[PDB]
Design a protein around this motif. Structure first.
Motif, mmCIF file in Angstrom:
data_model
loop_
_atom_site.group_PDB
_atom_site.id
_atom_site.type_symbol
_atom_site.label_atom_id
_atom_site.label_comp_id
_atom_site.label_asym_id
_atom_site.label_seq_id
_atom_site.Cartn_x
_atom_site.Cartn_y
_atom_site.Cartn_z
ATOM 1 N N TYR A 59 40.396 33.321 46.252
ATOM 2 C CA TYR A 59 41.845 33.500 46.268
ATOM 3 C C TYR A 59 42.254 32.073 45.916
ATOM 4 O O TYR A 59 42.429 31.232 46.797
ATOM 5 C CB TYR A 59 42.313 33.883 47.676
ATOM 6 C CG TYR A 59 43.795 34.164 47.801
ATOM 7 C CD1 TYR A 59 44.413 35.151 47.023
ATOM 8 C CD2 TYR A 59 44.576 33.470 48.725
ATOM 9 C CE1 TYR A 59 45.776 35.438 47.167
ATOM 10 C CE2 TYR A 59 45.933 33.748 48.879
ATOM 11 C CZ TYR A 59 46.526 34.733 48.099
ATOM 12 O OH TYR A 59 47.861 35.023 48.274
ATOM 13 N N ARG A 61 44.843 30.183 45.231
ATOM 14 C CA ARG A 61 45.866 29.412 45.932
ATOM 15 C C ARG A 61 45.306 28.747 47.186
ATOM 16 O O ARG A 61 45.723 27.654 47.559
ATOM 17 C CB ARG A 61 47.056 30.305 46.284
ATOM 18 C CG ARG A 61 47.915 30.636 45.079
ATOM 19 C CD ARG A 61 49.109 31.501 45.455
ATOM 20 N NE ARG A 61 49.966 31.765 44.300
ATOM 21 C CZ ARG A 61 49.632 32.548 43.280
ATOM 22 N NH1 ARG A 61 48.452 33.161 43.262
ATOM 23 N NH2 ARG A 61 50.479 32.718 42.272
ATOM 24 N N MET A 74 36.294 49.274 49.119
ATOM 25 C CA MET A 74 37.112 48.548 48.145
ATOM 26 C C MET A 74 37.944 47.454 48.830
ATOM 27 O O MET A 74 38.862 46.887 48.234
ATOM 28 C CB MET A 74 38.039 49.503 47.383
ATOM 29 C CG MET A 74 37.314 50.511 46.492
ATOM 30 S SD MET A 74 36.248 49.728 45.259
ATOM 31 C CE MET A 74 37.453 49.282 43.997
ATOM 32 N N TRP A 89 42.745 43.114 52.348
ATOM 33 C CA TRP A 89 43.429 44.340 51.957
ATOM 34 C C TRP A 89 42.559 45.142 51.007
ATOM 35 O O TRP A 89 41.477 44.695 50.621
ATOM 36 C CB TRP A 89 44.781 44.018 51.306
ATOM 37 C CG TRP A 89 44.693 43.176 50.066
ATOM 38 C CD1 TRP A 89 44.397 43.602 48.804
ATOM 39 C CD2 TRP A 89 44.914 41.763 49.973
ATOM 40 N NE1 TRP A 89 44.424 42.543 47.927
ATOM 41 C CE2 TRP A 89 44.734 41.400 48.619
ATOM 42 C CE3 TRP A 89 45.245 40.766 50.905
ATOM 43 C CZ2 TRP A 89 44.876 40.080 48.169
ATOM 44 C CZ3 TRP A 89 45.388 39.452 50.458
ATOM 45 C CH2 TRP A 89 45.201 39.124 49.098
ATOM 46 N N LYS A 90 43.028 46.328 50.629
ATOM 47 C CA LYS A 90 42.256 47.180 49.741
ATOM 48 C C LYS A 90 42.591 46.951 48.266
ATOM 49 O O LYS A 90 43.758 46.918 47.873
ATOM 50 C CB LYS A 90 42.465 48.654 50.113
ATOM 51 C CG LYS A 90 41.459 49.603 49.454
ATOM 52 C CD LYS A 90 41.647 51.060 49.883
ATOM 53 C CE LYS A 90 41.520 51.244 51.392
ATOM 54 N NZ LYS A 90 40.235 50.696 51.922
ATOM 55 N N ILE A 91 41.547 46.773 47.463
ATOM 56 C CA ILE A 91 41.675 46.561 46.028
ATOM 57 C C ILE A 91 41.957 47.901 45.348
ATOM 58 O O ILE A 91 41.299 48.893 45.650
ATOM 59 C CB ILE A 91 40.356 46.001 45.438
ATOM 60 C CG1 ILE A 91 40.108 44.580 45.947
ATOM 61 C CG2 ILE A 91 40.405 46.032 43.913
ATOM 62 C CD1 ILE A 91 41.183 43.587 45.550
ATOM 63 N N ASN A 92 42.931 47.934 44.442
ATOM 64 C CA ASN A 92 43.235 49.166 43.716
ATOM 65 C C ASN A 92 42.648 49.018 42.315
ATOM 66 O O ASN A 92 43.177 48.279 41.486
ATOM 67 C CB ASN A 92 44.746 49.404 43.606
ATOM 68 C CG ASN A 92 45.075 50.773 43.013
ATOM 69 O OD1 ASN A 92 44.306 51.318 42.219
ATOM 70 N ND2 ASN A 92 46.223 51.327 43.387
ATOM 71 N N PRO A 93 41.547 49.729 42.029
ATOM 72 C CA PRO A 93 40.901 49.652 40.715
ATOM 73 C C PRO A 93 41.753 50.108 39.534
ATOM 74 O O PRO A 93 41.479 49.737 38.395
ATOM 75 C CB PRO A 93 39.657 50.520 40.896
ATOM 76 C CG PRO A 93 40.138 51.576 41.844
ATOM 77 C CD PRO A 93 40.909 50.760 42.867
ATOM 78 N N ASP A 94 42.786 50.902 39.804
ATOM 79 C CA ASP A 94 43.649 51.414 38.741
ATOM 80 C C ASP A 94 44.743 50.466 38.286
ATOM 81 O O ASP A 94 45.396 50.719 37.277
ATOM 82 C CB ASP A 94 44.287 52.739 39.167
ATOM 83 C CG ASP A 94 43.260 53.805 39.480
ATOM 84 O OD1 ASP A 94 42.224 53.848 38.785
ATOM 85 O OD2 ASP A 94 43.493 54.605 40.408
ATOM 86 N N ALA A 95 44.946 49.380 39.023
ATOM 87 C CA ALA A 95 45.980 48.406 38.681
ATOM 88 C C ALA A 95 45.389 47.204 37.956
ATOM 89 O O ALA A 95 44.214 46.878 38.134
ATOM 90 C CB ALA A 95 46.696 47.946 39.944
ATOM 91 N N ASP A 96 46.206 46.539 37.147
ATOM 92 C CA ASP A 96 45.736 45.376 36.409
ATOM 93 C C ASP A 96 45.217 44.277 37.331
ATOM 94 O O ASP A 96 44.246 43.607 37.000
ATOM 95 C CB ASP A 96 46.841 44.825 35.504
ATOM 96 C CG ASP A 96 47.201 45.781 34.385
ATOM 97 O OD1 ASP A 96 46.307 46.524 33.930
ATOM 98 O OD2 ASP A 96 48.370 45.786 33.949
ATOM 99 N N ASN A 97 45.857 44.090 38.483
ATOM 100 C CA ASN A 97 45.401 43.069 39.424
ATOM 101 C C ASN A 97 44.007 43.433 39.918
ATOM 102 O O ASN A 97 43.125 42.576 39.999
ATOM 103 C CB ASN A 97 46.345 42.963 40.626
ATOM 104 C CG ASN A 97 47.586 42.134 40.331
ATOM 105 O OD1 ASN A 97 47.741 41.585 39.237
ATOM 106 N ND2 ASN A 97 48.476 42.034 41.319
ATOM 107 N N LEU A 107 41.310 36.710 42.700
ATOM 108 C CA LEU A 107 42.190 37.520 43.532
ATOM 109 C C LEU A 107 43.598 36.927 43.573
ATOM 110 O O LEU A 107 43.744 35.717 43.313
ATOM 111 C CB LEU A 107 41.618 37.609 44.949
ATOM 112 C CG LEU A 107 42.244 38.597 45.932
ATOM 113 C CD1 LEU A 107 42.084 40.022 45.416
ATOM 114 C CD2 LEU A 107 41.568 38.441 47.294
#
Lengths: 107, 87
Positions: A59, A61, A74, A89-97, A107
């Motif tokens: 991360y 920062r 995830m 937190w939970k990573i969302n594979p469908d989002a660009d982030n 991250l």
């Protein structure tokens, strides 16, 4: 004499600040109190101690931070360079982030 | 399932109807609610993720880390995010 939740990688203060993410770790309790903060603390330790959880990225920062990811849930948990728990937190594979993290560890 | 939930939250925040703290907590509830919800615009999906990350950087304490922001800074970012996605 510190709070009972102040030990190892945690502090009651930090857990309280990040309880909003407890839902990503199987804790649906809406109330935030010693009991639920404890459940959250335990859930984070369980994530970190999982054999399927491994180091993956940072991360940025938070300089020198190391992120620990679990491909099954995830979830990610950010640990500062000094080893203290920061957040998770939970990573969302469908989002660009989410994809950026999976592909580059950023991250 | 209100697919605009996270965006509506951001608008309540910019209008100061809810505080930065309230926004930062409710955004996590709404995000979790929409997580994995197929039939969701990518524009709306990604806008929410950026709102979620903007909130993660918010810290009300004056002794916040140098990379963290206060509520005024969060307001600026949230507005910037919505405009970016034209929402």
């Amino acid at each position: 004499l510190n709070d009972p939740l102040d030990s190892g990688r945690f502090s009651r203060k930090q857990l309280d600040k990040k309880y909003k993410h407890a839902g990503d770790f199987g804790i649906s309790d809406t109330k935030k109190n010693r009991e639920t903060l404890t459940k959250f603390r335990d859930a984070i330790e369980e994530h970190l101690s999982d054999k399927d959880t491994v180091e993956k990225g940072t991360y940025r920062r938070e300089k020198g931070s190391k992120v620990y990811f679990n491909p099954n849930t995830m979830n990610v948990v950010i640990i500062k360079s000094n080893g203290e728990f920061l957040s998770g937190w939970k990573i969302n594979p469908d989002a660009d982030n989410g994809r950026i993290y999976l592909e580059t560890g950023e991250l | 399932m209100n697919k605009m939930a996270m965006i509506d939250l951001a608008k309540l925040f910019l209008a100061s109807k809810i505080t930065a703290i309230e926004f930062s907590e409710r955004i996590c509830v709404e995000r979790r609610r929409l997580y994995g919800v197929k039939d969701l615009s990518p524009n709306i999906l990604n806008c929410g993720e950026e709102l979620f990350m903007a909130a993660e950087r918010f810290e009300p304490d004056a002794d916040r880390a140098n990379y963290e922001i206060d509520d005024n800074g969060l307001k600026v970012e949230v507005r910037s995010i919505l405009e970016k996605f034209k929402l």
